[PDB]
Design a protein around this ligand. Sequence first.
Ligand SMILES: Nc1ncnc2c1ncn2[C@@H]1O[C@H](COP(=O)(O)OP(=O)(O)OP(=O)(O)O)[C@@H](O)[C@H]1O
Ligand SMILES: CN[C@@H]1[C@H](O)[C@H](NC)[C@H]2O[C@@]3(O)C(=O)C[C@@H](C)O[C@H]3O[C@@H]2[C@H]1O
Ligand SMILES: [Mg+2]
Ligand SMILES: [Mg+2]
Ligand code: NA
Length: 248
Amino acid sequence: NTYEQINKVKKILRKHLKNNLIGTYMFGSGVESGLKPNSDLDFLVVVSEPLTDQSKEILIQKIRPISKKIGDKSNLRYIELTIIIQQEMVPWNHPPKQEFIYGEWLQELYEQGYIPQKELNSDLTIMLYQAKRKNKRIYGNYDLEELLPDIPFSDVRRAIMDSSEELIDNYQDDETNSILTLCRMILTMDTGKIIPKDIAGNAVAESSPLEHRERILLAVRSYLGENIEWTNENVNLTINYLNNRLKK
Ligand SMILES: Nc1ncnc2c1ncn2[C@@H]1O[C@H](COP(=O)(O)OP(=O)(O)OP(=O)(O)O)[C@@H](O)[C@H]1O
Ligand SMILES: CN[C@@H]1[C@H](O)[C@H](NC)[C@H]2O[C@@]3(O)C(=O)C[C@@H](C)O[C@H]3O[C@@H]2[C@H]1O
Ligand SMILES: [Mg+2]
Ligand SMILES: [Mg+2]
Ligand code: NA
C-alpha cells in the first residue's frame, strides 16, 4: 500500500529523532500532482539540532527496508528524505544548508558506508520553494509555511541555473526525468509557477523543433504508463537543446 509506507516513514522519524523532530512534510507528486506509475515519495524533515554520524546511519538502515530499490518489480515506491535544520535557514541564504539526504540513487554508496554530511545544495532551494507553496504536514505542531522564511524567486532562478549543470551531465539512465525537469526549469524561469512533469513536458514540446518535440513527448509518455526504451533515440541532442534554451 502507498499510504502504508508514509505511515511507516512517520513512525521511523518520530521514534528515532524523538524530541529533535520539529515536523515532517511531503511535497512532490503526493501533494500537488497525482502519483504516476513510477513516482516517488518526497519528504522534507525539519529538526532542531544537527544529527550525528551514528544517527544518520540509523535512518539509512531503518528507511532502506521500506523503500523501493532501483530495478524492482515491486509495489513499493522510492522514498526520498531530506532533513533541514530550522535554525540554519534564517537569515535566508542561497544555497541553503542541507543536513541529510536519503536517495535511492545513492544506495550503492549507503552500502559502502557513505553517510551524507552537512553540505550546501542549490537544488534544495527549488525543493523548499515548492514545498512551502504546497505540501502535506504528516507530523509536527507547525506548518512548513511557519518554519521557513519566504524564499525570493531570484534565488529560485539561481538554483535552476546552478542545479542545471548537474542534471545535464547525468541524464544517462535517467533520460525521462532529465528531459522533463529541464522542461520544468524552462517554464519556471519564464512562468513562475511549478508545473507537474507531464504538463511541463507537453508545453515545452509544442514549443520546440520537431526532432526534440517528439523526444520530449516520448518522455511524457514514459513518465506516465508507457514503457519507453531510450536505447536508439540519442537523448543527448534533446537535452543539449533544452540546455541552450534554458541557458538563454
Ligand atoms: N523548475 C523546477 N520545478 C520543479 N522541480 C524542479 C525544477 N528544477 C529542478 N527541480 C527538481 O526536480 C525534483 C522534482 O522532484 P521529483 O523527481 O520527485 O518530481 P515530482 O514532481 O515528485 O514527480 P514524480 O516524483 O512523479 O517523478 C526536485 O529535486 C526539484 O528540486
Ligand atoms: C533531489 N532530487 C532527486 C535527484 O534529482 C535525483 N537525481 C540525482 C532524481 O533521481 C530520479 O530521477 C531517479 O531516477 C531515482 C529516483 C529515486 O529519484 C528520481 O528523482 C530524483 C530527484 O527527486
Ligand atoms: Mg514525488
Ligand atoms: Mg523523483
Ligand atoms: Na530509473
